[PDB]
């Protein structure tokens, strides 16, 4: 079976890592890397403890489809209580480090206490030791990966380490694995510096041994590989333009935001789109991109591999940024560009570059810059605080506030804080674009009906991997619907929930979506583990991880009172396109989500539903 | 299955533990005649010389060493063979039955015909009694004489000078080793020798022994020349055949040895040979001959039991290889060291110095080294088997082996091991 | 008769396919760690190139070992190990001037590509045709039509 | 886990600082002949090969010997001589192809290279780094990577 | 202690090799290796025997870090009264020899007297003996030691020889070891020649015990060999380009001599410089250059490794001179080239191959043939006299020379004589440039002044490696200071001596003074040898060998008046460069040094410097 039944559990305090059994009986009713990692977490703490501490806990975890020959099958995750929320942080890597955490022997690392000195972590297949890291506090990414890879003279060694913002305890730093390709969101960089642990090497030479049936595995991987390379999307559209092909079409629908959420259409959208990826520089007469990469396993290759420009003002005189690195997302992209009115795709690409090096998250980064932004133009802040001029669209402006809040010089500092601190701290809470703590993706709530409420009732925060229905709306890939009515859309948020929590359990990629479903699941996960592996059960999983999820954020000191929007979505009309004059309607949706899932209409569960999935 | 081995020395032993080690799910049986541990006879000089005990000559010295791997030891003498029905008659009146045969019986000495070569005083040295019976005679200050200057000879005349006697040794030949040594190489030794102290009378055979009035006196030796020596202890090392007494009725074929082919296996199906009793293929034109030393027990013993095991294995060639250490003097020979007829091809190169005790001599048949020689020479002298082992073409290297026969590691690396190191 | 392996280094993208494919129809159990193909990648210019044995002619891996259990095959014209005449003398390794032909410190012998006696599983499992298996002569077609139908210039806007 | 010695012999300048330790530590004096790595030099090229033992896996010096004195280190994987079971009989001497085992005289035994139990002293002297002590497995990364470098062309200049 | 406490004394007159025990409380005054040997020199012979007879002595010596874990630590000594100047002459080779005396048993061997027969000596850690070497008489050094070797059976024989230049007396003949390694300068072939004798073997297998404390001198040794892994010019510098690396550097200053000191620059030195050695030939597309190898125990690796080329019109003929030997180092690539304006590269390699296999020295025959090209083209030589047009920048008249010259054959026998006499013998004495005979090295003393008052003051004729200050003025490793100035040098003179005397008394390389000074030497001493080794101690011990040495040459006969100049270098400005219209100033310097020194007006040490240094 896929799971390799061994956990490490260090001890940070005085070391001591002694290896433990799995826990079966548990595992048959969460499938891993996203239900069994959480089961811990809820089974052995306590929700009440602060965020960054000595009594936190970290777990890394993969599934059981992680480091197989199955399609896209070599991702992990990191679950945590977030610092920048309060709520239950879990964060979804790929790369090649799960993989190599497979290969190793072990499939589930806890990391437990504060240790008084800087370490690090090293594994090689029965044994796990601390080192001493005194001579690497202090380094960036790429610094510390070149440096542990040389003294150990092992090129075949997969390191995992944070930046200089996850030593000044940022509250968005993030860990960062080969480079590019890191967790974020809710800032597990903080609460991993804040262990004193600075990274873990690994390194691999066992094997994935023990699926319960090798050739039905092979027949059924092959036969699976056959649908995702005959849909026009997984074949020729991500392989070819990646993720930001998406830019023009939002922006055809007038549902992109833009200088704060203050705007709905955004003018220069053509000129940092893929296609002005795809053209020829006049300086130089060769396109910003490469060639495209693939994680491990992938048959698809949605990556991104770029070039920046060597008369740029930015870079001109420092060689260091002059190689080829990952490209530009959707995400960065949008936060990077729209969010701020800039329209310079170089100062995009140095700003991601920092973030990349430095372990920073760019969607935070970008809000919180739009929101100082906005505050300096209306006139609390003033030039002599910040040491600049900050208007929109100012490329210089961003690059510096970049390097600050890399850096954590000056106001900086304040950067480090986040949208809705930083907004708190002058008297202006209605300016910060925030549910629960964290920023807003790059879709709009005014144009799309769905996504409001998805916004809203969100386990982690606002984020729009949890539940997405712009799949559906936009695309509509399993049914073209209506993106102007509100009738039906609970059970669309349900059905795309499970479903999501279902894809993210497993430990697989979520973009095979568009052209895999369940019944194209079921047999590889039938033919890898054992025991009785149905629809119904792979519905009543889903069912109970979200619950129990819930029931812990609920235990935790979170209620009904913060499931709301800020005034300017639900108050203020929109501005062009083909929205006219649409206000988001959330107040019609929310009674019909819980009284769908079966909730107390102050969302608890109730004990109806409690008992039929077994959480009692 | 089954497999039943004859003999516990060297070649019984690791064919044993490889069999042990490829198939894990079989029964081992392994048979002895002597009344002592799994040993090592090339050991018994040490043992008369006083540097070790007994029990230092054993094979495995790990207590409870053949438990822990499932091999089943028994004692008794194979006197009986049949092969239609796969039977084997012992000489206790028990039987024993098999699916796989080894035979690796060993060698014997034999003596030659002389008149009261059947008295007390008359020992040879191949085991322990033996060497215990010549402990008990060989007080210092005693009365040796010595019989045969060959291998086996040397080293017991160097064992028994360096326990403090007087010693006399009669050669049958024209000089000492004339097996493993050139004429120049054997006089060197000789003239040595007799420095040393030892007399050395050659080109005679002994007449007849005879006895003294009582057996407390030692013994009268006539010689063939007329001269007669009084003796305390006589030492016969004349010569030793292989162990064949229960194949001459049999349908296996037995010349002077047991004939096999490369792999090691003779004309039976189910029967397999390796040891001093085997008659393997040549190295250079592919004829039968019988060599009698350990590397070449190791390498047959593990070749067959690998065979036999259900593997498939080949062997490459037998060669004839020797160290000989004597009161002082290191010499060493390789293959065909008397060189080959000049008229197809050959070549030779001989460097001597007298004074200083020094000898090299190299041999090329054609293109390819066939042979050496040394007196003297220690440190990598085990490049010479790689050499001449593996046929390894020389080219323009053999020129400068013609003159300077010391660089042939210089050579074995620019040709067989890195070629590509010194390209620029 | 014979045939080669094509390697095209434009057109990987490092999913590590290979190696899975060729660890598991030779051990049992997947683990790249024991493949005898190995992809590089140089991040500075953002290549990714496999490469492995080319099955030389005049083998420097052939001429080297002591017992001779290395020998040709007539039928696909590629060297093989005869794992139960080797003894482990690691001298193999040291003569080849590629770098492949390695050790095996579990099993105790060594290995390199023996082109699976004429079916080759590599080149099945890659999903971008980066590795192909075409006759050993004539390698060259493909780039050799694509350069004739672009390096000469249509007598065209001229 | 075992490990294993890496020569590299492009980087050696003969400057016999490796003799210097492996005999300090194992006789207790500055001798560079008692040593159990040697250099030879080839002028006429002007080229330097530094030589030792492989361990073999198979190994003739242990199954040539008849008294029981050379043994496996499970956790280094060497063979080790104990001088105090060995009689100095010299036949491992003439069985090993490669001649790397040898006779001493002043105590009247022989010697050989065991790893100095997982922590070579000659690695640690080399100025140049032409002896490195890494895994036994993949020894040959390093020219793979240069080959794939040099023989695999980009697209460049064309 | 790094002594072996044994010396041979062998009496070439009938044999009789007898050893005998060293002379302490002259060991802890000298250290050894140039002031143990000229002690036991000047305090048992003549300062008025001729130079070659049966009279005269040789001492051959090592140092008490030789043979040891010491970087560099491979160094020896030969010690005589020189038959080219009439002084007392000391010359340091390395290779692998010192190495193996020290091995042996013995750190010091004598020679007296005179065979009737040729002979050689052989070693073997107690057994020295003599035989009869009649076969060997008229073979280069090759020859010898190849046929040395194949006689005794052994490949690991330490041999050292004179050429066909030594056994005919020419006037500057060397000894050659190990090939391409050598002495040279004052002519110690002509006085080994002049005994019968033909070549010393040694063979040790003893090895160097007898150290005070072992893991301190372990440990002192390590931490010494950082400081010379970290500096630019002994990492990098070095290892790269060998000596050759300065032809270019003094070119650009305008101090370097071409012609017979007719030029201060030179037009073609780009072509014969370091550079030169390192590009493609056109006919076969490979570098001169091959690799770089290191004497023994030195981590610095400067030396050099050539091949010929096989078409050139030189060796075209000839296939025993294909194979690959010894480079250019910078002193034979100027002797060779422009000092008399020649600017082939295959011709200097050819000259530099004769040189190295008939023994003899590059620097004295090249400014040789340079004074006789020069007497050709006034006109005082004619071409039936030399048989050969001999015009500045003729390769063929080089090579043609040098070949009779090394076999001694028609007007080489005139060449032989030195520059000196030669010129004295055609009645124009003006027209040598050299001081107590030896001819100049490759340095200019009208750009540079420091040079020229090395050059006048030196206790072995013109030397520039007893003071050297272009390392203060030039590369200025110490401090940078002024090549134009004539204050402050007699100080800078002192002191270069001073540490020069030590350093080669030590018995390591000098070019490790780059990167070393006198406080990372004391420590290896300290824990190497017996006594109290301070640093006051190591200044009285030079001082005290640089003023035995002086006082035993002007016992000799030389005086005051032979601190001289030739009048070309004090009367004739400068042609060009960035010296142009300078000249030299020893007269406004050498009183100033007699001052600083101590001495009299007339350069006699005075007895109150006597009486301290404890000379009496
Ligand atoms: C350098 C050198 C030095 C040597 N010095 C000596 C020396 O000093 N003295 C010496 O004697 N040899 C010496 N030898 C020879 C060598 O020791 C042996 O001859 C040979 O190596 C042993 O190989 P083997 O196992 O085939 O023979 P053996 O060890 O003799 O194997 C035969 C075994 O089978 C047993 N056996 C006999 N008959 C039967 C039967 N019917 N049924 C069952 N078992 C039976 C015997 O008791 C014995 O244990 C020397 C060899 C070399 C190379
Ligand atoms: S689809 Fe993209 S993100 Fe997902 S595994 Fe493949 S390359 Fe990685
Ligand atoms: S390791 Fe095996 S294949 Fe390689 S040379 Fe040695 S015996 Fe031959
Ligand atoms: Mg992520
Ligand atoms: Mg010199």
Same mark, same amino acid.
């Given at each position: 079976?896929?799971?390799?039944?061994?956990?490490?559990?260090?001890?940070?305090?005085?070391?001591?890592?002694?290896?433990?059994?799995?826990?079966?009986?548990?595992?048959?009713?969460?499938?891993?890397?996203?239900?069994?990692?959480?089961?811990?977490?809820?089974?052995?703490?306590?929700?009440?403890?602060?965020?960054?501490?000595?009594?936190?806990?970290?777990?890394?975890?993969?599934?059981?489809?992680?480091?197989?020959?199955?399609?896209?099958?070599?991702?992990?995750?990191?679950?945590?209580?977030?610092?920048?929320?309060? &709520?239950?942080?879990?964060?979804?890597?790929?790369?090649?480090?799960?993989?190599? #955490?497979?290969?190793?022997?072990?499939?589930?690392?806890?990391?437990?206490?504060?240790?008084?000195?800087?370490?690090?972590?090293?594994?090689?297949?029965?044994?796990?030791?601390?080192?001493?890291? %005194?001579?690497?506090?202090?380094?960036?990414?790429?610094? !510390?990966?070149?440096?542990?890879?040389?003294?150990?003279?092992?090129?075949?060694?997969?390191? %995992?380490?944070?930046?200089?913002?996850?030593?000044?305890?940022?509250?968005?730093?993030?860990?960062?694995?080969?480079?590019?390709?890191?967790?974020?969101?809710?800032?597990?960089?903080?609460?991993?510096? =804040?262990?004193?642990?600075?990274?873990?090497?690994?390194?691999?030479?066992?094997?994935?041994?023990?699926?319960?049936?090798?050739?039905?595995?092979?027949?059924?991987?092959?036969?699976? @590989?056959?649908?995702?390379?005959?849909?026009?999307?997984?074949?020729?559209?991500?392989?070819?333009?990646?993720?930001?092909?998406?830019?023009?079409?939002?922006?055809?629908?007038?549902?992109?935001?833009?200088?704060?959420?203050?705007?709905?259409?955004?003018?220069?959208?053509?000129?940092?789109?893929?296609?002005?990826?795809?053209?020829?520089?006049?300086?130089?007469?060769?396109?910003?991109?490469?060639?495209?990469?693939?994680?491990?396993?992938?048959?698809?290759?949605?990556?991104?591999?770029?070039?920046?420009?060597?008369?740029?003002?930015?870079?001109?005189?420092?060689?260091?940024?002059?190689?080829?690195?990952?490209?530009?997302?959707?995400?960065?992209?949008?936060?990077?560009?729209?969010?701020?009115?800039?329209?310079?795709?170089?100062?995009?690409?140095?700003?991601?570059?920092?973030?990349?090096?430095?372990?920073?998250?760019?969607?935070?980064?970008?809000?919180?810059?739009?929101?100082?932004?906005?505050?300096?133009? $209306?006139?609390?802040? !003033?030039?002599?605080?910040?040491?600049?001029?900050?208007?929109?669209?100012?490329?210089?402006?961003? *690059?510096?506030?970049?390097?600050?809040?890399?850096?954590?010089?000056?106001?900086?500092?304040?950067?480090?804080?986040?949208?809705?601190?930083?907004?708190?701290?002058?008297?202006? /809470?209605?300016?910060?674009?925030?549910?629960?703590?964290?920023?807003?993706?790059?879709?709009?709530?005014?144009?799309?009906?769905? +996504?409001?409420?998805?916004?809203? $009732?969100?386990?982690?925060?606002?984020?729009?991997?949890?539940?997405?229905?712009?799949?559906?709306?936009?695309?509509?890939?399993?049914?073209?619907?209506?993106?102007?009515?509100?009738?039906?859309?609970?059970?669309?948020?349900?059905?795309?929930?499970?479903?999501?929590?279902?894809?993210?359990?497993?430990?697989?990629?979520?973009?095979?979506?568009?052209?895999?479903?369940?019944?194209?699941?079921?047999?590889?996960?039938?033919?890898?583990?054992?025991?009785?592996?149905?629809?119904?059960?792979?519905?009543?999983?889903?069912?109970?991880?979200?619950? #129990?999820?819930?029931?812990?954020?609920?235990?935790?000191?979170?209620?009904?009172?913060?499931?709301?929007?800020?005034?300017?979505?639900?108050?203020?009309?929109?501005?062009?396109?083909? *929205?006219?004059? #649409?206000?988001?309607?959330?107040?019609?949706?929310?009674?019909?989500?819980?009284?769908?899932?079966?909730?107390?209409?102050?969302?608890?569960?109730?004990?109806?539903?409690?008992?039929?999935?077994?959480?009692? | 299955?089954?497999?039943?081995?004859?003999?516990?020395?060297?070649?019984?032993?690791?064919?044993?533990?490889?069999?042990?080690?490829?198939?894990?799910?079989?029964?081992?049986?392994?048979?002895? %005649?002597?009344?002592?541990?799994?040993? =090592?006879?090339?050991?018994?000089?040490?043992?008369?010389?006083?540097?070790?005990?007994?029990?230092?000559?054993?094979?495995? @010295?790990?207590?409870?060493?053949?438990?822990?791997?499932?091999?089943?030891?028994?004692?008794?003498?194979?006197?009986?063979?049949? %092969?239609?029905?796969?039977?084997?008659?012992?000489?206790?009146?028990?039987?024993?039955?098999?699916?796989?045969?080894?035979?690796?019986?060993?060698?014997?000495?034999?003596?030659?015909?002389?008149?009261?070569?059947?008295?007390?005083?008359?020992?040879?040295?191949?085991?322990?009694?033996?060497?215990?019976?010549?402990?008990?005679?060989?007080?210092?200050?005693?009365?040796?004489?010595?019989?045969?200057?060959?291998?086996?000879?040397?080293?017991?005349?160097?064992?028994?000078?360096?326990?403090?006697?007087?010693?006399?040794?009669?050669?049958?030949?024209?000089?000492?080793? /004339?097996?493993?040594?050139?004429?120049?190489?054997?006089?060197?030794?000789?003239?040595?020798?007799?420095?040393?102290?030892?007399?050395?009378?050659?080109? *005679?055979?002994?007449?007849?022994?005879?006895?003294?009035?009582?057996?407390?006196?030692?013994?009268?030796?006539?010689?063939?020349?007329?001269?007669?020596?009084?003796?305390?202890?006589?030492?016969?090392?004349?010569?030793?055949?292989?162990?064949?007494?229960?194949?001459?009725?049999?349908?296996?074929?037995?010349?002077?040895?047991?004939?096999?082919?490369?792999?090691?296996?003779?004309?039976?199906?189910?029967?397999?040979?390796?040891?001093?009793?085997?008659?393997?293929?040549?190295?250079?034109?592919?004829?039968?001959?019988?060599?009698?030393?350990?590397?070449?027990?190791?390498?047959?013993?593990?070749?067959?039991?690998?065979?036999?095991?259900?593997?498939?294995?080949?062997?490459?060639?037998?060669?004839?290889?020797?160290?000989?250490?004597?009161?002082?003097?290191?010499?060493?020979?390789?293959?065909?060291?008397?060189?080959?007829?000049?008229?197809?091809?050959?070549?030779?190169?001989?460097?001597?110095?007298?004074?200083?005790?020094?000898?090299?001599?190299?041999?090329?048949?054609?293109?390819?080294?066939?042979?050496?020689?040394?007196?003297?020479?220690?440190?990598?002298?085990? &490049?010479?088997?790689?050499?001449?082992?593996?046929?390894?073409?020389?080219?323009?290297?053999?020129?400068?082996?013609?003159?300077?026969?010391?660089?042939?590691?210089?050579?074995?690396?620019?040709?067989?091991?890195?070629?590509?190191?010194?390209?620029? | +008769?014979?045939?080669?392996?094509?390697?095209?280094?434009?057109?990987?993208?490092?999913?590590?396919?290979?190696?899975?494919?060729?660890?598991?129809?030779?051990?049992?159990?997947?683990? /790249?760690?024991?493949?005898?193909?190995?992809?590089?990648?140089?991040?500075?210019?953002?290549?990714?190139?496999?490469?492995?044995?080319?099955?030389?002619?005049?083998?420097?891996?052939?001429?080297?070992?002591?017992?001779?259990?290395?020998?040709?095959?007539?039928?696909?014209?590629?060297? +093989?190990?005869?794992?139960? $005449?080797?003894?482990?003398?690691?001298?193999?390794?040291?003569?080849?001037?590629?770098?492949?032909?390695?050790?095996?410190?579990?099993?105790?012998?060594?290995?390199?590509?023996?082109?699976?006696?004429?079916?080759?599983?590599?080149?099945?499992?890659?999903?971008?045709?980066?590795?192909?298996?075409?006759?050993?002569?004539?390698?060259?077609?493909?780039?050799?039509? &694509?350069? &004739?139908?672009?390096?000469?210039?249509?007598?065209?806007?001229?």
């Amino acid at each position: 079976m896929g799971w390799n039944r061994k956990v490490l559990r260090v001890n940070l305090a005085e070391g001591t890592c002694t290896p433990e059994p799995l826990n079966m009986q548990w595992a048959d009713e969460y499938l891993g890397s996203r239900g069994l990692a959480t089961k811990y977490l809820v089974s052995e703490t306590d929700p009440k403890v602060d965020p960054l501490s000595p009594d936190n806990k970290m777990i890394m975890a993969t599934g059981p489809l992680t480091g197989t020959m199955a399609s896209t099958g070599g991702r992990y995750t990191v679950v945590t209580k977030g610092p920048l929320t309060g &709520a239950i942080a879990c964060s979804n890597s790929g790369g090649f480090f799960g993989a190599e #955490m497979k290969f190793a022997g072990w499939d589930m690392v806890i990391f437990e206490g504060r240790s008084p000195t800087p370490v690090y972590l090293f594994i090689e297949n029965e044994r796990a030791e601390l080192r001493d890291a %005194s001579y690497l506090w202090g380094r960036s990414c790429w610094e !510390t990966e070149e440096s542990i890879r040389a003294q150990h003279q092992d090129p075949l060694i997969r390191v %995992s380490s944070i930046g200089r913002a996850g030593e000044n305890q940022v509250m968005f730093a993030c860990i960062v694995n080969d480079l590019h390709r890191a967790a974020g969101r809710s800032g597990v960089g903080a609460v991993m510096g =804040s262990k004193n642990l600075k990274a873990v090497a690994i390194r691999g030479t066992k094997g994935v041994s023990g699926i319960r049936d090798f050739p039905g595995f092979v027949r059924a991987t092959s036969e699976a @590989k056959k649908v995702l390379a005959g849909n026009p999307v997984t074949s020729e559209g991500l392989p070819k333009f990646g993720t930001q092909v998406l830019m023009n079409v939002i922006n055809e629908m007038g549902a992109l935001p833009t200088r704060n959420h203050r705007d709905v259409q955004f003018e220069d959208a053509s000129k940092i789109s893929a296609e002005a990826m795809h053209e020829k520089r006049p300086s130089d007469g060769k396109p910003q991109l490469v060639t495209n990469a693939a994680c491990f396993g992938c048959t698809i290759a949605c990556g991104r591999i770029s070039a920046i420009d060597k008369t740029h003002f930015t870079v001109k005189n420092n060689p260091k940024y002059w190689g080829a690195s990952g490209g530009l997302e959707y995400e960065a992209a949008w936060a990077l560009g729209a969010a701020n009115g800039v329209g310079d795709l170089e100062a995009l690409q140095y700003a991601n570059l920092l973030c990349n090096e430095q372990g920073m998250d760019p969607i935070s980064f970008g809000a919180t810059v739009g929101a100082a932004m906005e505050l300096y133009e $209306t006139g609390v802040l !003033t030039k002599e605080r910040i040491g600049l001029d900050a208007p929109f669209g100012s490329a210089d402006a961003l *690059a510096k506030l970049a390097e600050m809040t890399a850096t954590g010089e000056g106001f900086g500092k304040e950067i480090g804080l986040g949208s809705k601190r930083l907004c708190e701290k002058y008297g202006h /809470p209605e300016l910060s674009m925030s549910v629960k703590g964290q920023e807003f993706p790059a879709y709009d709530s005014r144009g799309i009906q769905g +996504m409001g409420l998805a916004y809203a $009732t969100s386990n982690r925060g606002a984020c729009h991997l949890r539940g997405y229905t712009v799949a559906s709306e936009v695309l509509g890939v399993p049914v073209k619907t209506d993106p102007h009515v509100i009738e039906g859309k609970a059970e669309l948020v349900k059905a795309f929930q499970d479903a999501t929590a279902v894809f993210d359990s497993a430990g697989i990629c979520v973009f095979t979506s568009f052209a895999w479903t369940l019944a194209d699941v079921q047999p590889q996960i039938a033919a890898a583990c054992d025991g009785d592996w149905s629809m119904d059960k792979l519905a009543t999983v889903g069912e109970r991880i979200w619950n #129990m999820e819930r029931q812990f954020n609920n235990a935790a000191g979170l209620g009904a009172q913060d499931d709301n929007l800020p005034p300017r979505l639900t108050s203020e009309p929109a501005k062009s396109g083909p *929205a006219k004059g #649409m206000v988001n309607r959330l107040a019609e949706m929310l009674p019909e989500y819980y009284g769908v899932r079966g909730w107390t209409p102050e969302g608890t569960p109730t004990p109806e539903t409690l008992s039929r999935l077994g959480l009692s | 299955m089954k497999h039943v081995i004859l003999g516990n020395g060297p070649a019984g032993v690791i064919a044993a533990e490889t069999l042990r080690r490829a198939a894990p799910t079989d029964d081992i049986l392994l048979f002895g %005649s002597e009344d002592a541990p799994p040993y =090592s006879r090339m050991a018994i000089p040490y043992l008369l010389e006083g540097n070790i005990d007994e029990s230092g000559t054993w094979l495995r @010295k790990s207590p409870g060493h053949f438990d822990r791997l499932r091999i089943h030891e028994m004692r008794g003498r194979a006197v009986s063979l049949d %092969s239609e029905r796969r039977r084997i008659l012992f000489d206790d009146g028990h039987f024993e039955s098999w699916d796989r045969l080894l035979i690796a019986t060993g060698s014997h000495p034999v003596r030659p015909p002389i008149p009261g070569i059947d008295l007390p005083e008359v020992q040879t040295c191949w085991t322990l009694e033996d060497a215990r019976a010549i402990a008990r005679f060989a007080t210092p200050g005693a009365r040796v004489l010595q019989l045969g200057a060959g291998f086996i000879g040397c080293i017991i005349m160097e064992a028994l000078a360096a326990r403090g006697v007087e010693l006399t040794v009669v050669e049958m030949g024209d000089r000492m080793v /004339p097996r493993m040594m050139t004429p120049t190489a054997g006089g060197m030794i000789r003239k040595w020798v007799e420095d040393q102290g030892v007399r050395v009378v050659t080109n *005679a055979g002994v007449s007849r022994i005879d006895c003294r009035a009582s057996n407390d006196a030692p013994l009268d030796v006539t010689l063939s020349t007329g001269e007669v020596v009084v003796a305390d202890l006589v030492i016969v090392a004349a010569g030793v055949a292989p162990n064949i007494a229960f194949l001459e009725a049999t349908p296996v074929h037995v010349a002077k040895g047991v004939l096999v082919d490369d792999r090691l296996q003779t004309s039976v199906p189910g029967i397999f040979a390796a040891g001093d009793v085997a008659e393997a293929p040549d190295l250079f034109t592919g004829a039968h001959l019988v060599a009698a030393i350990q590397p070449n027990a190791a390498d047959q013993a593990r070749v067959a039991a690998l065979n036999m095991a259900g593997h498939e294995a080949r062997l490459k060639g037998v060669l004839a290889i020797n160290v000989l250490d004597t009161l002082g003097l290191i010499s060493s020979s390789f293959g065909q060291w008397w060189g080959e007829e000049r008229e197809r091809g050959g070549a030779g190169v001989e460097h001597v110095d007298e004074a200083a005790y020094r000898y090299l001599s190299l041999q090329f048949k054609d293109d390819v080294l066939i042979g050496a020689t040394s007196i003297g020479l220690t440190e990598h002298v085990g &490049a010479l088997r790689g050499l001449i082992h593996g046929r390894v073409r020389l080219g323009e290297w053999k020129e400068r082996l013609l003159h300077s026969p010391l660089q042939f590691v210089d050579a074995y690396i620019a040709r067989s091991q890195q070629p590509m190191a010194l390209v620029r | +008769m014979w045939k080669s392996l094509h390697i095209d280094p434009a057109k990987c993208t490092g999913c590590l396919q290979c190696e899975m494919a060729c660890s598991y129809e030779h051990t049992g159990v997947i683990n /790249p760690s024991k493949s005898r193909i190995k992809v590089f990648s140089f991040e500075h210019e953002g290549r990714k190139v496999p490469y492995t044995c080319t099955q030389c002619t005049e083998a420097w891996c052939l001429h080297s070992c002591p017992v001779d259990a290395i020998r040709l095959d007539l039928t696909t014209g590629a060297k +093989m190990v005869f794992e139960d $005449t080797c003894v482990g003398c690691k001298v193999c390794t040291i003569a080849c001037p590629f770098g492949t032909i390695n050790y095996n410190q579990d099993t105790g012998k060594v290995q390199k590509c023996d082109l699976c006696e004429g079916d080759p599983a590599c080149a099945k499992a890659c999903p971008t045709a980066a590795i192909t298996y075409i006759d050993a002569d004539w390698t060259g077609l493909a780039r050799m039509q &694509a350069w &004739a139908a672009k390096a000469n210039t249509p007598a065209s806007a001229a």
